[PDB]
Design a protein around this ligand. Structure first.
Ligand code: HPA
Ligand code: HPA
Lengths: 338, 338
DNA sequence: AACGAAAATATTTTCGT
DNA sequence: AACGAAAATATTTTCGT
């Protein structure tokens, strides 16, 4: 069809291309004629044909876990922006932590020739780290690891440990000592890593967390609902609680309220993520903020680099969580004593 | 590179293709040899080259508004599923209700030759309905209209009017008569249309809604926060409130609580959407449920049809909202009197 | 019976003059 | 000075025998 435009403008295709891409000088009239034909015929250059020759689709892929979760959704939407303001088109794929699903997507992606790969899989078993190496060619960056798990990728690091620690400290400094904790999957950095940062602070404070007080969650509100229930559904209960993620916390709040508890008069609760609608939780949620836009942009920007400037060496950039004081934490029994 | 595989297997490319696509019979050994070469070379067929010839990218596009909003996020994630379980790859693009942005995406999409187009733009000014016609060729379906706004598309209809009406009725039947309402943008079906369904029920009940009691929102929690504030920040206040969407409602709840109000002992609140985490709102949110998966799948399924079975005529399928009774609405002053 | 030669798909870019 | 001819990119598919 570039033919059809060309013969209607009475010029070569080679010319038609040139005016379209401003790849070289074309006479005014000539350039106008082409436009005219271009308009009449109603022409839309084939991006596929072109990519075939230029060798790049100007389109990147997202091998994600899930897209509904607040945490996720925000990151992605940020990524989309960056892609768009820089020409890239975005292919989104959710693996659901399912190997086959991830193997399939990884393939469709390579075949559809994505220019780069944005990886957010949550849990990375060896089998997965393997598949990834098989694609060490297509440039990529994992955005959800605690450290550099490999050498064939660029990685961005959230410092979820120094966050957990920050969370613990606050509680401590608020006068708390009987603290419980509902963490997210341990096979996750955002789970196991935040937890540990937490426990460190606990140890330096000589605080012990009774195991009847640590309840695993899956980051979904329902899980936090059941964890809170268990923690308070017992003889001795803590005076404060550290929740792995905001959306689980929102589920902790519910149960608390459902059992006549008052947060934070009865129980203080601190979460982690700082989701967009956190402030509108009842009460406004005190939590640890994860820079999600900066995560998105910073990842997209690493990929581009490697992409354009053909970099080959691994790169890892750190990002930092920070505390956000809202209205869900109350002073503790030992506050005055410090 | 299909060449490289072929000459290593000592067979034509034509053969290499055939075994790959099982497009025709190949001898066992021959088929195995090809596989072998295929494996050694580490070959990934070029989906672009192929699409060039077959004329279809086996990939559809989402011209969305935003992707973070709960309402949206859910629909999309549902769409992704359908795409994936049927071979399609998903290109997501958020227009942000920005014409240029929408014009740009619409183009990149046509150029990148999407096989079909899923449209969710929220507000459709004439200028936009126009651009859309310019692409009446590429098969598409709008999923967010109240009726069939045009003839060059398939449409799925939510019946947001019969929902608003349902919402009103409940309140009425609960013993309420002093009701306020924070609706979503009127330029939206989910805004203007739910509102009207509401007001109808109000009229048949001879209830008048004092204008100091109707406050527009933008579907974002913050807006609901300010609307509730205004409604209750006044002399005479209603005994119940109908909120256009759940996430705004969650913002209504906050303010209510912030002003010492008790939902629903003080104010009953009913929303619309039935988002995944609605039940974990404090209190568990009574709302009108919008079948979002069914929306996604049903749209994807219309598109496919038109796609494969080369249909040309418009099609419109209706979907139905339904009431979900939770714990945010209390009996009203006139309950006993009916 | 099982396979190949070559045309085709819609572009870009190299040398031309 | 301003433009074109033709090779190339990585596949599928038509007739062959
Ligand atoms: O895996 C996760 N899911 C949801 N929210 C989260 N916040 C941190 N990690 C996660
Ligand atoms: O446009 C919308 N945005 C967010 N939530 C919604 N629920 C219905 N319509 C909308």
């Amino acid at each position: 069809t570039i033919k059809d435009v060309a013969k209607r403008a009475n010029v070569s295709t080679t010319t038609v291309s040139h005016v379209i891409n401003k790849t070289r000088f074309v006479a005014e009239e000539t350039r106008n004629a082409v436009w005219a034909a271009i308009k009449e015929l109603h022409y839309s250059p084939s991006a596929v044909a072109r990519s075939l020759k230029v060798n790049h689709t100007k389109s990147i892929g997202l091998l994600a876990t899930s897209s509904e979760a607040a945490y996720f959704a925000e990151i992605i939407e940020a990524v989309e922006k960056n892609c768009f303001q820089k020409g890239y088109t975005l292919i989104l794929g959710n693996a659901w932590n399912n190997l086959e699903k991830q193997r399939a997507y990884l393939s469709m992606m390579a075949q559809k020739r994505v220019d780069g790969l944005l990886v957010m899989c949550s849990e990375y078993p060896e089998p997965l780290l393997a598949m990834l190496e098989e694609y060490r060619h297509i440039p990529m960056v994992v955005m959800d690891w605690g450290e550099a798990k490999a050498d064939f990728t660029d990685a961005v690091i959230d410092n979820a440990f120094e966050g957990g620690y920050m969370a613990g400290r606050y509680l401590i400094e608020r006068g708390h000592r009987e603290i419980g904790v509902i963490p997210g999957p341990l096979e996750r950095n955002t789970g196991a890593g935040r937890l540990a940062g937490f426990m460190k602070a606990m140890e330096e404070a000589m605080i012990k967390v009774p195991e009847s007080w640590i309840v695993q969650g899956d980051f979904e509100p329902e899980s936090g609902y059941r964890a809170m229930q268990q923690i308070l559904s017992q003889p001795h209960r803590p005076t404060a609680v550290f929740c792995g993620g905001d959306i689980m916390a929102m589920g902790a709040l519910c149960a608390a309220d459902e059992m006549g508890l008052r947060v934070p008069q009865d129980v203080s609760l601190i979460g982690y993520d700082n989701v967009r609608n956190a402030r509108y939780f009842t009460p406004a949620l005190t939590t640890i903020h994860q820079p999600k836009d900066s995560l998105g942009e910073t990842a997209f920007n690493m990929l581009l680099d490697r992409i354009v400037n053909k970099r080959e060496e691994p790169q890892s950039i750190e990002v930092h969580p920070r505390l956000i004081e809202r209205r869900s934490v109350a002073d503790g029994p030992f506050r005055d004593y410090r």
